[PDB]
Amino acid sequence: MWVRGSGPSVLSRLQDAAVVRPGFLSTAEEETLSRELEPELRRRRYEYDHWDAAIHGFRETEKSRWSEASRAILRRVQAAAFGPQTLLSSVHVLDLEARGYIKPHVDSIKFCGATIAGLSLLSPSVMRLVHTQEPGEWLELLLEPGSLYILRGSARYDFSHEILRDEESFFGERRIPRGRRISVICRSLP
Ligand SMILES: O=C(O)CCC(=O)C(=O)O
Ligand SMILES: [Mn+2]
Ligand SMILES: [Mn+2]
């Protein structure tokens, strides 16, 4: 339902490395995050785009000070996705416009440890993972609003990830129309 792959072996190999938990958040939790983050994101302009930037059509913030309700959600993510690992001192909040997208990349190994965990809000999208040496090994993850994904180990180090732009936004054969998306990303310390 939420993962498709280039073949059975990549699917088995990454089954606990690339994880989607649809409906990890309740509607109330989605609302908590939106009410806290929408106003903060509105204070910033969508950034200038660059050809050699991974992220296109976006604004963002780092946030370490959170309401108690949002902190309860972040602690649920930490329990679900991270061992005992330490998290970075801030959480990355990313606002992609409907025309925005993310190009294939591997998160910096200088600043991010073994695990990335992301909450998706507002609208559905498709995350594609592609092996960095072998373009024939890939996964597609369907990220609906309220979902948590986890990329760890090989899914974090050996595969790029990207968020498909509207015209390319397909989960298998199915078109996933893109809208404005907010994501809330927790990362481990290296
Ligand atoms: O929006 C997401 O879920 C991922 C963002 C991302 O890949 C990044 O900021 O490195
Ligand atoms: Mn920025
Ligand atoms: Mn990334």
| 86: amino acid identity, one letter | T
Q: Whose CA is nearest to atom 2 of ligand 1?
A: 183
Cα–Cα distance for residue pair 88/170, rounded to 1 Å = 32
Mutate to test the pocket of ligand 1, among 19, 91, 102 (most ligand atoms within 8 A of CB): 102
Helices (H), 17-117: 27-42, 68-81
Q: Is the CB of 94 under 6 A from ligand 1?
A: yes
- CA separation for the pair 180, 122 (Å, rounded): 7
Determination technique used: X-ray
User: Could you tell me if 58 and 99 are in contact, meaning their C-beta atoms sit under 8 angstroms apart?
Assistant: no
- Residue for token digits 């903060």? 40
Resolution, Å (one decimal):
1.4
Q: Tokens 């983050």 map to which residue?
A: 37
Distance CA 172, CA 188 (A): 31
**1-190 maps to which CATH number?**
2.60.120.590
**CA–CA separation, 147 and 118 (whole Å):** 8
Domain ranges of the chain: 1-190
Find where tokens 């190999």 sit: 13
